[PDB]
Design a protein around this ligand. Structure first.
Ligand SMILES: NC(=[NH2+])NCCC[C@H](N)C(=O)O
Ligand code: NA
Ligand code: NA
Ligand SMILES: [Zn+2]
Length: 866
């Protein structure tokens, strides 16, 4: 498979302006007729090169003339000797039922549906399958009326008809030019939730959510979130929906999360379907996020699209930033920022240290589906948020307005967006652009000095980014570095120098620099990198008392949580070293007292308390170490939980009881109290056994919602409580017919600390609720084992690696995108000890030798083995 490079971008030799599609739909054999109006922009002797994959070509006409000047090559139809303007007609066949990869036109249960991003439209017809080619689409769909009573494509219905032999047809027209990755088609039988939204300016939009028959009871929250998203985009960004109808289709078979096809979003059902007995608080908030996300793409992705796929973060970074701002505005900003920071430090930093490291705008891609990454999305959003930090809200919105004014109706680049922000705000972002082209996490080192004679506080800040596998050369970045200084009473000391205020966002642009502040009337406790103001590792020599002081006094709730994380990091590192020596947990009394104080603080927001009382995950803990010892980390996390459970037992029980709620509400105050109560339950589960067992069993049985039932079930599994097997069997007996609910249970099985977890996981491949045909099931069992049970995945006998090899040998052929998600834990081998590295390397070498190795796996395996 061949790598493509960003620097090789060239404008296309041909454009297509209009395409008229006809689908004669059938699961075994679909006939596609595509009539394209094309224009040659290049040299009269340049051929038209159409992308196409697994298509059976029936005919090629140019202006109704059967065409003889063409050839098929690997992945292409190359058409020669064309006039400057012409009509291209292609007829071809495809086979939706054979499409197990779920890219192009495929089958999801009884439905037919599409996934075209990034390069799936070439699996439907021969096309200029590249996002700088925008065209106006019409789509005629002909199908069996009984099997496919709903026939949907982008835009508005403009025609419809009945045919003989029980067939019917519908034709759709979308007035906005689009790249073909935004094309969608859906055919099937559905329940439809219908509602309306009236925009600020008075446009009435029909909202339609299509769900499998029988699921209308699980649709209203997604509909509510859609209306919430539309309203928010109006209030916050001044953006209105631009069509007459908004369709969402929930499908059970879907590779990723959801897809922003214009006017016809297609969603993994996990991000649509929710009822209080099936879905947790986190499911409701994820539905809200993803619904908003795809909606936000209407402007940031659709009205302005991507010139080429190396510009992916132009839409994904910006849209993730928007979904975070949406969630943060509607809910707890602090909890959102905290959770997004966990994801950055715990998952994205790991990617930026891995063989798959890339800048947010990549330079080299073999398989573009490999670049839908934590980096492109989450780090891309941190880069957008840094622009917001540098510019302020008002200048940021002016930049947004200039971006749309310049680029509406076109395909743009990351550079175009930065340029708009810079021009609108008059903030110079020339140095800042390096964030787009440089991979790896910067390390920011801070030294400080207080001078009592001059009342001056001096910060010496240095930065470096270590070399990554993809880039030998690194340079200093423009790092917005937000600080606060606290006096002995917990009050903020005004920042100033030479009689003038100083902005609290420091511009750290050099390898090393010194910031001096005057009138610093007391030796400060600093809050550094406030609200995680740049996506960097902070090296500062904190004392425990500085951190507990910030926990108590810091102005922003995020800083209080972050201080608790820095406090814990020291002791996680200590205790992992001790575990390796065979020693038990050591924890100063004053550290345990810090957490007791949070439990007993009556003024603290319970949402904040809950996060401080949620220990860093084994993934967040892993990024504290150069060499990861996954067994030590898992055992230390447990022991730290047991120690705090013992030390805080009475307080934990009191707070658990105090936060009891009889009514279930998906409302932020209620969610916060419930999150705190279940955080207390998790510690209690690891306390005295009989009490743990009674508490956990009682909560499982008395829960009037899935959040509380699952929190109890999960604690029963984590703490290996007596009641575990019973509750697990009850849940299976109740829920086996519901795949999305069973995904929770498969995750609990996959992440079990039990000695025999791999044996149980292998057996579950035969479970009534599991199937290798379904990406959600695969990810919930196998993915959760490899990715979220690193202790068992990295069992010293190499059994975890061998299991994953077996699964990937199947999935390489069945669904390479899902296989490529699942290989990720194996490509981290250089983070592990030599003995584990040699086994993981052997596993990778075995996969490399697969007959018909997918480009998806090839790209990752070769980087990992280099
Ligand atoms: N199979 C894929 N590569 N899917 C990518 C679709 C992601 C979609 N644009 C989103 O932001 O959610
Ligand atoms: Na808020
Ligand atoms: Na110092
Ligand atoms: Zn997106």
């Amino acid at each position: 498979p061949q790598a493509k490079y960003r620097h090789d971008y060239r404008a296309p030799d041909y454009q297509i302006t209009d395409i008229d599609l006809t689908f004669d739909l059938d699961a075994q054999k679909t006939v596609v007729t595509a009539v394209s109006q094309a224009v040659r922009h290049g040299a009269s002797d340049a051929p038209l090169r159409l992308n196409g994959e697994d298509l059976k070509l029936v005919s090629v006409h140019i202006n109704d003339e059967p065409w003889t000047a063409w050839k098929e090559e690997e992945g292409a139809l190359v058409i020669s000797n064309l006039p400057e303007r012409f009509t291209l007609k292609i007829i071809n066949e495809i086979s939706p039922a054979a499409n197990t990869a779920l890219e192009g036109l495929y089958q999801s249960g009884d439905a037919l549906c599409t996934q075209c991003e990034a390069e799936g439209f070439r699996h439907i017809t021969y096309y200029l399958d590249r996002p700088d080619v925008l065209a106006r689409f019409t789509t005629k769909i002909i199908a069996d009326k009984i099997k496919y009573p709903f026939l949907l494509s982008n835009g508005n219905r403009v025609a419809q008809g009945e045919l003989e032999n029980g067939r019917h047809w519908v034709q759709w027209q979308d007035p906005f030019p689009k790249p073909c990755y935004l094309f969608a088609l859906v055919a099937g039988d559905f329940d439809v939730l219908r509602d309306t939204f009236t925009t600020r300016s008075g446009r009435e939009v029909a909202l339609e959510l299509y769900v499998d028959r029988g699921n209308l009871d699980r649709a209203p929250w997604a509909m509510t979130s859609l209306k919430n998203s539309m309203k928010w985009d109006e209030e916050r960004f001044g953006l209105e929906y631009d069509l007459d109808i908004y369709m969402i289709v929930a499908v059970d078979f879907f590779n990723m999360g959801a897809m922003e096809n214009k006017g016809l979003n297609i969603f993994n059902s996990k991000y649509v379907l929710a009822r209080t007995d099936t879905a947790t608080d986190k499911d409701y908030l994820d539905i809200e996020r993803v619904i908003g996300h795809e909606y936000f793409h209407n402007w940031t992705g659709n009205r302005v699209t991507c010139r080429d796929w190396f510009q992916l973060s132009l839409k994904e970074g910006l849209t993730v930033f928007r979904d975070q701002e949406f969630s943060s505005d509607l809910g707890s900003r602090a909890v959102n920022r905290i959770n997004n920071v966990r994801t950055m430090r715990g998952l994205q930093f790991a990617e930026d240290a891995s063989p798959m490291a890339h800048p947010i705008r990549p330079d080299m891609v073999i398989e573009m589906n490999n670049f839908y990454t934590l980096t492109v999305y989450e780090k891309g959003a941190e880069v957008i948020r840094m622009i917001h930090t540098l510019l302020g809200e008002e200048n940021f919105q002016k930049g947004m307005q200039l971006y749309f004014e310049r680029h509406d109706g076109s395909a743009a680049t990351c550079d175009d967006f930065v340029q708009a922000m810079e021009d609108a705000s008059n903030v110079d972002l020339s140095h800042f652009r390096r964030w787009y082209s440089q991979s790896g996490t910067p390390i920011v080192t801070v030294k400080d000095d207080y001078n009592p004679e001059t009342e001056q506080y001096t910060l010496t800040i240095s930065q470096r980014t270590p070399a990554t596998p993809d880039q030998a050369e690194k340079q200093p970045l423009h790092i917005p570095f937000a600080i606060e200084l606290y006096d002995n009473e917990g009050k903020v000391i005004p920042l100033q120098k030479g009689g003038h205020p100083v902005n609290s966002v420091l511009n750290v642009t050099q390898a090393e620099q010194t910031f001096v502040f005057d009138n610093v009337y007391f030796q400060p406790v600093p809050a550094l990198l406030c609200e995680f103001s740049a996506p960097v590792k902070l090296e500062y020599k904190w004392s425990d008392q500085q951190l507990t002081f910030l926990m108590r006094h810091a102005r922003n709730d995020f800083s209080r949580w972050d201080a608790a994380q820095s406090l814990l990091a020291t002791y996680i590192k200590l205790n992992v070293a001790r575990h390796q020596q065979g020693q038990p947990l050591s924890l100063p009394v004053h550290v345990a007292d810090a957490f007791r104080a949070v439990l007993l603080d009556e003024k603290i927001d319970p949402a904040l308390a809950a996060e401080i009382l949620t220990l860093p995950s084994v993934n967040e803990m892993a990024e504290l170490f150069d060499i990861i010892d996954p067994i030590a980390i898992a055992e230390v996390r447990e022991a730290l939980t047991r120690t705090l459970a013992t030390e805080l037992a009475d307080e934990l029980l009191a707070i658990y009881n105090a936060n009891y709620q009889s009514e279930y509400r998906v409302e932020h105050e209620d969610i916060a109290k419930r999150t705190l109560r279940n955080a207390c339950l998790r510690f209690l589960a690891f306390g005295e056994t009989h009490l743990a067992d009674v508490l956990v069993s009682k909560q499982f049985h008395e829960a009037n919602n899935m959040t509380d039932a699952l929190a109890a079930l999960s604690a029963a599994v984590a703490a290996q409580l007596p009641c575990r097997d019973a509750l697990m069997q009850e849940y299976d007996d109740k829920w086996h017919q519901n795949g999305l609910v069973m995904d929770k249970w498969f995750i609990l099985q996959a992440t079990s600390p039990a000695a025999n977890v791999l044996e149980t996981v292998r057996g579950l491949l035969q479970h009534r609720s599991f199937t290798m045909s379904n990406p959600n099931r695969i990810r919930s069992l196998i993915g959760a084992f490899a990715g979220s049970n690193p202790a068992a995945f990295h069992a010293e006998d190499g059994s975890g690696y061998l299991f994953l090899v077996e699964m990937l040998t199947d999935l390489n052929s069945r669904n390479p995108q899902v296989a490529s998600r699942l290989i990720e834990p194996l490509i981290r081998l250089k983070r592990y000890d030599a003995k584990r590295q040699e086994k993981m390397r052997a596993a990778l070498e075995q996969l490399k030798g697969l007959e018909n190795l997918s480009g998806d796996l090839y790209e990752k395996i070769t980087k990992a083995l280099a």
